[PDB]
Design a protein around this nucleic acid. Structure first.
Ligand SMILES: [Mg+2]
Ligand SMILES: [Zn+2]
Ligand SMILES: [Zn+2]
Ligand SMILES: [Zn+2]
Lengths: 160, 264, 114, 180, 65, 773, 196, 43, 49, 133
RNA sequence: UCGAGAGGAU
């Protein structure tokens, strides 16, 4: 791997470094090894980094793996878009997946949750667990046909 | 002889006229062929009422074919536009009625040529409405074919119109147009693989211009004044009057601008 | 279906004038003439002949849309010279060449033998 | 086709059998048809399982022996480097479908483009049958003046595309002109 | 399905040369290239009207109604 | 999700699309029958009753007219058939459902709706014919083609609804996209092909063509520019006439490969005050790119000037290209006779380099590379050997493509072209691939029954020596057809997965919006980000600009920023400042520069901690580079007169400015610390460029100009801030689902399979690895 | 469309005068654009235009069979016999002006196919039309004078814009706004509808 | 009409891809797009 | 030029489409997956001709 | 409002930079050894052979529309066969007591390097160039 | 109204 790194004069110059590439994954026994740098070693398995190096180390490992997908196709997306998506998966404390048995098992209302997948089964449990909906979700007000809190709808307007 | 554009006819015929349009501006040569093709008024069929059609062809197939049949249009100025005349639908001052009847009374395949068109309305003594026959056998244009037991009865109304509205009123087929066959004007950049000169054929009009000397530099600030033209005519109007009525239709089109400027 | 009737290329519609003249804004001696029901057949011969008149500073036409048949013409002339008079002499300069062409061709045609 | 020894490995079908085939095509006296080719042992019916064990030839000139100057513009065809033939292909264009054999020069094209045309040559307009006037079916579109194409496949004759075309030889100029 | 009266590209009347064109190939034993040149068709826009034409009218006649 | 989350609606339309160069950008072609069908309820006022009474009198069958009229009772009145259709007295307060007319706001749709920029408002321009007309440059935000594509249209029925299309959802507002922080609309395919041929130095235009080109610009001032050449023939360059489209106050600088300030290759772009100075206009100048003309003009002059600018470039260049002309023959694929000799030689020497490797493998003299089998090393070598033949022979052809070659000219301008297409059309199409490898042994030990068994040669495995010009052989035709099936499968497989991916992302983040404290939240109120995007700026008003504190030697960093009043040799020369001689020594002022220099040194350490790669080019909300160029031209500064700024003006002024850049406005310190944390990188940029040596020496500003830059930077900052109410997660979803849709084509999981692993968190991954340092 | 996957709708109908012409008066029936050539690599389209052009002049048929030994260089030997550029270029003149086009135009006949998709068979527009019985929503399809779907895929796009009142308009006033009455004790629409 | 009578269907481990065995019997190119590409083939 | 090969039901001419299927009465060896208790199968689809 | 610079140059190199009607010209001032210029010229109108000697002038006149000459009464300020109109985009110093001025005559580029033009060649938009036989 | 097939789009 080629790498630019500061010279004593201060300008960046390229210092080539030898980097091993493996076919497998076990972080708990690989980083605890003499002769490596255990401060910068990396896997392309963010799920292993989350349980080993802490959740917040997995968040940056999650975002970098999204970036390598985009930049391999040559495209460019701004930072905040992917980093919003990464933080939503990461905020719940583990690795919340964007799937029907992932984020959609949250407490984020019912009519919002019933609009994605497993539609009728959610209303069944909500009829049992007697859930009350805040109706501040976008999909609650779309289903009820109201002006949702969407920009224009975030505020009320009244006279002096 | 008159001061202005000079014309020298190289070749001429009943259908083709080859001349050189010397000492003219470019826009006059191009507005000529634009007004030659479209704005000349000429007569062709614009309405068809079908009595009986036992043919295989649909009526509007045949109605499309009848419009493109070339009719005589020499004394066309004595004819009037239907939108101009005061008749109810059409009259003899504006329109020329035609009539076609055909029956298959032969075991052989019976053709329906254009020369079988017959004229009903009064011509008022002008060269108007006669379908052109250039066929060496004399049979005009193969409109339809008939088996035994088939008939076709219809009435064609030929009205006056302009080729901008529909191409059936087309006086001329295709206008040859070349200026500067050596490209001494450098009006185009030649595409080539090895040599521009050997990959492109010399025009026939290259003989009637001075071959340039490559040691001589670019003759800049020269403009296109000499044009080479060749006019085909369908036959509705003779070739000599296609261009002359083209000049007149353009000159009349300039004239309507003058009268509009005075009225304001 | 949606296409207009094909005579609108050369027939003036309801309440339409042939020439509508408007003066140009932010130009001393300039005018805009909205030729109706006309095209590049007519406009290029006007513009190319205006350029031959040595008292014309600007002369150009454009077609706003190939759908419709109309074009705008802009002329710029020296002070004390209405471009309508520069237009009038230019169009009249055209017809003299056209009428000379008509008789020159008819003279040369009847000389030819076929 | 069928290849065996002779005096060497050569096709069974000869020019004498070919002339009697075209003698049958003139008469449209000891007729010669495709079954006569099959029953004289000159042609075999080879399926996918049985062609696992055979060595086919692409062109009948691969069998001619070999021993320089050549036209540079043609395709680069590899010398086949094979001798022990059992069969020979009738013609390599006979791998194509009925719709793909409409396409001119498919060997000079990208293979998705050959596929893309084959889906919409079925939706071109034309005369599907001569009795369109007689039939009364739910929907029918017939071209006014259909034209046989100026560039025809050799396998167009057996598809009757020249006899029942679906388009017109439009005069096509590729040109950047008015940006429409 | 029947001979176009005029060429699409240039508008020359090609609707009269059909009966002549067929008999040029047969009664004179000509080829198609010299046949089109004889009939006054010289531009290729004209030539593809007659050459590429499939006269389907002859099959339409055989249907007796 | 079929009747509530989305339902069929009236006041809608649908037809084909076609492209109109003489349409404006935000204008839409609407057929009359569509406008005769669609209505808008308009209440009668004193202002409109003279028009509306005529419209009702005009009738519904021909437009402009009206179809229904509503009284105060609410009982509708049918104008298609009634007695009083010609006898109407419009009392005030009545509702008249008129037709759609010119310059009305309507939505423009394209399915699939992968974008917020795929549903943009349009100004109605009613046209006669039956197709929706749209501008050339609006294709890419819809992925529009004209090969039979169709587009929808929706009509608002109330004034607030009309306002939201015009002031939020309009075409000019969505020109710069929050996705990719760049414009989405650029010059396409004809203008783009023409604007290079226009801008060539050989390309010169005469007076007759130039005057028509001038009047084609709509908002033109009426001033003929003085020609480039005047003596033999007054002649204009294409750069002369094209520059009239670019508005005054536009500066643009760009450098690439051979870019001197004389530019012998005519490359690069230098644009000053609405005139281009040298260059060739092409895709890197005028395409929808980061830091292009569309990026400058939309920021500088606004959206409406740039939307009007889109047409004005088209109307000139299409006029030039209409009269210049352009085509593509098949001689644009023919290479030299000698070039074909070396190309088939290039194939042959690589064909023998496989046979030498194969014979080496056949005698078991092959050395097995580490980690991989002996057979896998043979496949890896030969695939690499033959691609190098395909890549070189194609690059042998692009050498031989002359300057007049029309395929080359599209590659040159970036309209529609690539190198590989030249390699396949002229030199050698290459080797086909199925499932990542060569053509498999479907038959026993052979690919086709015309080869002997166990033939691992290039011909019997998928390599296609002949080109599309030369003609593919029968065996090559099938392998090319075999690999093409996987692509049409791969094209059809990914789009269902991608369409699932986009829907999963949107419904995950649909409640995500910036609330009224810059905190990203959801309906429950669970905070996801405290500052949106970790700095608090909308991704639209964001540009890439280098922080040159990072790069360069410490001594070179020193010379550009160290000012020692106490030294005689490293001090502001009295040429630079009126107070130059009186400032020397002055112990109370060198403490301010040393405080400045100690912070710029601390800043360089700070960014070097974060930016380990050292690439300073990173996007930041305010383009200071364009601001300073404005002050150099708005105030006609010379590079000889000394400044009006004492050192106390600069150093105290910049430090006062950072307090006035605002993101959060709380009165407690942990918000103020978050506010300090929000702007911290921008100040590191701001102090780097507004430094006391750099202000006085590199761009010799004055006191009047300097106070304006502080007013510009503060105002541009507060503009470039997220507006509370923006649903950003929905935008975040589509900003990744749409580039996922354009994902299509040394073994690792990459792209859409890897993306399917990342989102749907994979217990077992198809290719895990450890990158060991 | 043509026989090589080259689709395309009609952008404009120009007359013969507006169309560019050559020195023989020949005028293209059809004008396509050169940028659809290199992206999709349809060289057979380009040879068909050449082989048809030599077939029209010579009066002989065109052999476009696959796996022939016919070359472009072999065809272009024949077209130079008939007095044109070997690779099909023709000096063409503008119709509007009459100036020779600076780029010589690739010109020739090419078999084209009129596909079955017509605009007036696809033109569709609707306002306040029929309603479905079950859902009180607009009916499906243009064949029943139906309404276009404002799908959930489109609902996300108006959410990202922030157009909230347009979202309420597109979902109530268009397509099945309905008023119903509910009780304050039991939150259900059990109440007897009593209005007048 | 000619190409309907030679159409095949496969009611549904890599079936959709073109096999070497398809040489001579199934058209390599003629197939639909999208929905069932390679499942529905022509002879 | 009509080719036949179609039935005529209720005036609407119908085409029986071909139906691809694996051949019966052949022995095939199928390597099973790695998380499987059994590793290889020999399948024979047995039906009378 | 008059002549700013005058010199006489002998051309060293003429280079058609992949161009047909423009060449890159290279010359130095005769009677001087610390001044040289590099300029883009139109060879189609004015053929510039190598090792020719060309008098070169720069003016400031002789805003508003460019009207055509219209007559000989509008008297040209050029006894030359070639002229051009351009804009100065940058001025750089090679060294102390040295200078270099950059002009763009509508994409046609000139570089003038020397010392003694210090009384002229200012930063203003207006600039001409006159070249004799 | 429900179920089936066929294309059009990316
Ligand atoms: Mg499309
Ligand atoms: Zn009358
Ligand atoms: Zn013709
Ligand atoms: Zn209750």
């Amino acid at each position: 791997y080629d790498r630019k790194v500061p010279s004593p004069t201060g300008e960046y110059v390229k210092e080539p470094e030898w980097v091993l590439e493996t076919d497998g994954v076990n972080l708990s026994e690989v980083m605890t090894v003499p002769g490596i740098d255990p401060t910068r070693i990396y896997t392309n398995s963010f799920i292993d980094i989350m349980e080993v190096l802490g959740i917040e180390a997995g968040r940056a490992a999650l975002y970098k793996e999204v970036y390598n997908v985009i930049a391999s196709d040559g495209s460019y997306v701004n930072y905040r878009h992917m980093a919003l998506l990464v933080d939503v998966m990461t905020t719940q404390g583990g690795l919340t997946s964007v799937t029907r048995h992932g984020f959609n098992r949250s407490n984020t209302g019912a009519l919002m949750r019933c609009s994605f997948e497993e539609t009728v089964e959610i209303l069944f449990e909500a009829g049992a667990s007697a859930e009350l909906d805040d109706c501040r979700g976008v999909s609650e007000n779309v289903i009820l046909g109201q002006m949702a809190p969407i920009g224009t709808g975030a505020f009320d307007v009244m006279i002096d | 002889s008159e001061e202005g554009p000079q014309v020298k006819i190289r070749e001429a015929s009943k259908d083709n006229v080859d001349f050189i349009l010397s000492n003219v501006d470019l826009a006059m040569a191009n507005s000529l062929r634009r007004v030659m093709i479209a704005e000349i008024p000429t007569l062709a069929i614009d309405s068809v009422e079908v009595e009986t059609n036992t043919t295989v062809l649909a009526d509007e197939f045949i109605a499309h074919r009848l419009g493109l049949i070339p009719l005589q249009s020499m004394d066309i100025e004595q004819l009037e536009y239907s939108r101009d005349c005061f008749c109810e639908d059409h009259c003899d001052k504006c329109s020329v009625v035609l009539t076609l009847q055909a029956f298959g009374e032969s075991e052989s395949t019976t053709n329906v040529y254009s020369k079988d068109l017959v004229i009903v309305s009064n011509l008022m003594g002008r060269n108007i409405g006669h379908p052109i026959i250039q066929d060496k056998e004399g049979n005009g244009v193969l409109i339809c074919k008939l088996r035994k037991g088939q008939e076709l009865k219809l009435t064609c109304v030929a009205k006056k119109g302009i080729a901008k509205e529909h191409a059936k009123w087309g006086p001329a087929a295709a206008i040859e147009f070349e200026y500067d066959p050596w490209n001494k004007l450098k009006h185009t950049d030649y595409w080539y693989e090895q040599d521009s000169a050997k990959e492109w054929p010399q025009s026939k009009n290259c003989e009637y211009e001075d071959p340039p000397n490559e040691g001589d530099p670019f003759d800049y600030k020269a403009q296109a004044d000499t044009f080479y033209m060749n006019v085909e005519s369908v036959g509705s109007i003779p070739v000599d009057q296609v261009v002359v009525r083209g000049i007149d239709t353009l000159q009349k089109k300039v004239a309507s601008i003058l009268l509009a400027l005075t009225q304001m | 279906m949606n296409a207009p009737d094909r005579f609108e290329l050369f027939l003036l519609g309801e309440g339409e004038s042939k020439l509508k003249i408007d003066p140009d804004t932010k130009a001393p001696n300039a005018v805009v003439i909205t030729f109706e029901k006309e095209d590049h057949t007519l406009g290029n011969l006007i513009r190319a002949e205006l350029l031959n008149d040595r008292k014309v500073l600007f002369a150009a036409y454009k077609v706003e849309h190939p759908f419709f048949a109309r074009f705008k013409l802009r002329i710029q002339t020296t002070e004390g010279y209405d471009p309508k008079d520069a237009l009038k002499n230019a169009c009249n300069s055209i017809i003299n060449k056209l009428g000379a062409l008509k008789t020159n061709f008819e003279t040369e045609w009847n000389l030819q033998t076929l | 086709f069928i290849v065996e020894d002779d005096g060497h490995k050569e096709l069974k079908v000869r020019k004498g059998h070919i002339a009697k085939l075209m003698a049958t095509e003139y008469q449209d006296v000891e007729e010669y048809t495709w079954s006569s080719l099959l029953n004289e042992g000159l042609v075999e019916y080879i399926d996918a399982e049985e062609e696992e064990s055979i060595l086919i030839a692409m062109q009948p000139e691969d069998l001619e022996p070999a021993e320089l100057d050549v036209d540079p513009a043609k395709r680069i065809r590899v010398s086949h480097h094979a001798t022990t033939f059992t069969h020979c292909e009738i013609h390599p264009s006979m791998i194509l479908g009925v719709a793909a054999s409409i396409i001119p020069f498919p060997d000079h094209n990208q293979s998705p483009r050959n596929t893309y045309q084959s889906a919409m040559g079925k939706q071109a307009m034309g005369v599907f049958l001569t009795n369109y006037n007689v039939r009364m079916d739910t929907m029918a579109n017939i071209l006014y003046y259909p034209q046989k194409p100026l560039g025809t496949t050799r396998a167009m004759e057996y598809l009757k595309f020249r006899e029942l075309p679906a388009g017109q030889n439009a005069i096509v100029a590729i040109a950047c002109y008015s940006g429409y | 399905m029947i001979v176009p009266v005029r060429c699409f590209s240039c508008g020359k009347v090609v609707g009269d040369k059909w009966e002549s064109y067929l008999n040029l190939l047969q009664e004179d034993e000509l080829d198609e290239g010299t046949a089109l040149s004889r009939l006054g068709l010289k531009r290729y826009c004209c030539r593809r009207m007659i050459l590429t034409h499939v006269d389907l009218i002859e099959k339409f006649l055989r249907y007796n109604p | 999700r079929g009747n509530l989350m989305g339902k069929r609606v009236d006041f809608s339309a649908r037809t084909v699309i076609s492209g109109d160069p003489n349409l404006e950008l935000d204008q839409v072609g609407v057929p009359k029958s569509i406008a005769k069908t669609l209505t808008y309820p308009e209440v009668v006022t004193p202002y409109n009753i003279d028009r509306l009474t005529q419209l009702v009198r005009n009738g519904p069958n021909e437009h402009p007219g009206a179809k229904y009229v509503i009284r105060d009772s609410g009982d509708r009145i049918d104008l298609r058939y009634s007695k009083r259709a010609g006898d109407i007295q419009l009392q005030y307060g009545w509702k008249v459902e008129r037709h759609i007319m010119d310059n009305d706001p309507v939505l423009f749709n394209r399915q699939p709706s992968l974008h917020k920029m795929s549903m943009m408002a349009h100004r109605v321009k009613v046209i006669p014919y039956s197709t929706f007309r749209l501008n050339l440059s609006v294709t890419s935000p819809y992925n529009a083609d004209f090969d039979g594509d169709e587009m929808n249209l929706h009509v608002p029925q109330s004034e607030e609804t009309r306002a939201e299309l015009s002031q939020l959802c309009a075409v000019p507002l969505q020109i710069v996209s929050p996705q990719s922080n760049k414009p989405c609309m650029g010059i396409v395919q004809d203008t783009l092909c023409g604007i290079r041929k226009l801008t060539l130095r050989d390309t010169f235009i005469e007076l007759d063509q130039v005057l028509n080109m001038l009047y084609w610009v709509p908002d033109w001032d009426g001033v003929i520019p003085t020609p480039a050449i005047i003596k033999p023939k007054p002649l204009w360059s294409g750069k002369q006439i094209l520059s009239v489209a670019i508005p005054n106050g536009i500066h643009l600088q760009r450098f690439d490969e051979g870019t001197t300030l004389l530019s012998p290759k005519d490359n690069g772009m230098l644009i000053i005050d609405g005139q281009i100075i040298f260059g060739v206009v092409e895709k890197k100048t005028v395409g929808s790119s980061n830091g292009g003309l569309i990026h400058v003009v939309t920021r500088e002059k606004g959206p409406q000037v740039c939307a009007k600018l889109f047409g004005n470039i088209q109307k000139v260049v299409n006029f030039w290209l209409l009269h210049n002309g352009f085509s593509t023959g098949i001689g644009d694929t023919i290479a030299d006779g000698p070039t074909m000799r070396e190309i088939t030689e290039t194939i042959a020497e690589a064909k023998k380099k496989v046979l030498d490797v194969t014979k080496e493998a056949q005698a078991n003299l092959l050395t097995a590379k580490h980690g991989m089998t002996l057979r896998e090393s043979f496949e890896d070598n030969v695939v690499r050997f033959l691609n190098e033949a395909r890549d070189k022979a194609g690059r042998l052809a692009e050498v031989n493509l002359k300057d007049l070659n029309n395929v080359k000219q599209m590659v040159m301008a970036g309209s529609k072209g690539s190198f590989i297409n030249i390699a396949q059309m002229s030199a050698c199409v290459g080797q086909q691939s199925v499932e990542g490898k060569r053509i498999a042994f479907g038959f026993v030990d052979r690919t086709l029954p015309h080869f002997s068994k166990d033939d691992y040669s290039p011909e019997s495995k998928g390599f296609v020596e002949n080109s599309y010009l030369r003609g593919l052989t029968p065996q090559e035709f099938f392998f090319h057809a075999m690999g093409g099936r996987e692509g049409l499968i791969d094209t059809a497989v990914k789009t269902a997965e991608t369409g699932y991916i986009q829907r999963r992302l949107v419904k995950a983040l649909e409640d995500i919006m910036v609330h009224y404290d810059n905190t990203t939240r959801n309906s429950l109120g669970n905070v996801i980000q405290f500052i949106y995007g970790e700095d608090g700026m909308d991704a639209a008003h964001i540009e890439k600009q280098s922080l040159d504190t990072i790069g360069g030697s410490d001594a070179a960093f020193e010379k550009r920023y160290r000012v020692d009043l106490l030294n005689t040799d490293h001090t502001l020369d009295p040429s630079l400042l009126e107070s130059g001689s009186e400032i020397l020594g002055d112990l109370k002022l060198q403490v301010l520069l040393d405080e400045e220099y100690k912070q710029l040194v601390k800043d360089r350490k700070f960014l070097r901690e974060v930016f380990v790669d050292g690439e300073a080019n990173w996007p930041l909300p305010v383009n200071i580079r364009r601001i300073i160029q404005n002050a150099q031209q708005t105030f006609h500064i010379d590079h000889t007169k000394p400044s009006d700024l004492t050192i106390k003006d600069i150093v105290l002024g910049v430090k006062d400015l950072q307090e006035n850049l605002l993101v959060l406005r709380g009165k407690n310190e942990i918000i103020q610390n978050a506010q300090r944390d929000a702007v911290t990188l921008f100040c590191c940029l701001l102090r780097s460029r507004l430094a006391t040596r750099r202000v006085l020496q590199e761009y010799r500003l004055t006191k009047q100009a300097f106070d304006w830059v502080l007013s510009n930077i503060e105002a541009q900052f507060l503009r470039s801030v997220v507006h509370p109410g923006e649903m950003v997660g929905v935008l975040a979803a589509q900003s990744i689902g749409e580039p996922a849709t354009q994902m299509t084509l040394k073994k690792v999981t990459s792209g859409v399979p890897r993306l399917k692993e990342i989102l749907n968190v994979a217990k077992n991954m198809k290719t895990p690895s450890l990158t060991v340092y | 469309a043509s026989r090589h996957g080259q689709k395309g709708t009609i952008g404009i109908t120009y007359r013969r005068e507006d169309m560019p012409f050559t020195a023989e008066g020949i005028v293209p029936d059809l004008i396509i654009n050169p940028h659809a050539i290199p992206s999709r690599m349809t060289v057979a389209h380009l040879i068909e235009c050449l082989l048809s052009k030599v077939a029209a002049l010579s009066g002989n048929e065109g052999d476009a069979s696959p796996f022939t030994d016919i070359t472009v260089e072999g065809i272009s030997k024949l077209l130079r016999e008939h007095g044109y550029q070997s690779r099909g270029f023709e000096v063409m003149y503008n119709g509007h002006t009459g100036k020779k086009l600076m780029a010589q135009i690739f010109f020739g006949p090419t078999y084209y196919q009129r596909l079955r998709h017509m605009v007036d068979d696809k033109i569709h527009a609707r306002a306040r039309g029929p309603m479905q019985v079950l859902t009180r929503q607009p009916v499906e399809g243009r064949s029943r004078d139906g309404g276009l779907r404002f799908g959930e895929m489109e609902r996300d796009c108006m959410i990202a814009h922030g157009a909230a009142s347009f979202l309420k308009e597109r979902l109530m006033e268009a397509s099945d706004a309905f008023r119903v009455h509910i009780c304050g004790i039991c939150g259900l629409m059990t109440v007897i509808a009593k209005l007048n | 009409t000619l190409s309907h009578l030679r159409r095949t269907n496969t009611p549904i481990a890599k079936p959709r891809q073109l096999h070497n065995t398809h040489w001579g019997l199934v058209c390599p190119a003629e197939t639909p797009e999208g929905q069932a590409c390679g499942l529905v083939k022509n002879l | 030029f009509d080719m036949g090969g179609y039935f005529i039901i209720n005036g609407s001419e119908k085409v029986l489409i071909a139906q691809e299927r694996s051949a019966g009465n052949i022995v095939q060896v199928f390597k099973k997956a790695a998380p499987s208790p059994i590793s290889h199968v020999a399948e024979i689809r047995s039906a009378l001709e | 409002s008059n002549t700013l610079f005058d010199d006489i140059f002998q051309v060293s190199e003429v280079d058609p930079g992949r161009y047909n009607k423009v060449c890159r010209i290279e010359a130095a001032s005769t009677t001087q050894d610390q001044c040289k210029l590099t300029l883009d010229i139109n060879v189609e109108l004015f053929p510039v052979a190598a090792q020719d000697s060309l008098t070169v002038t720069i003016a400031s006149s002789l805003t508003r529309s460019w009207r055509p000459p219209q007559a000989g009464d509008r008297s040209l300020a050029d006894d030359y066969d070639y002229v051009m109109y351009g804009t100065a985009y940058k001025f750089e110093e090679v060294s102390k007591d040295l200078i270099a001025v950059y002009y763009s005559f509508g994409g046609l580029l000139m570089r003038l390097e020397g010392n003694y033009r210090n009384l002229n060649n200012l930063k203003q938009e207006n600039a001409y160039l006159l070249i004799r036989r």
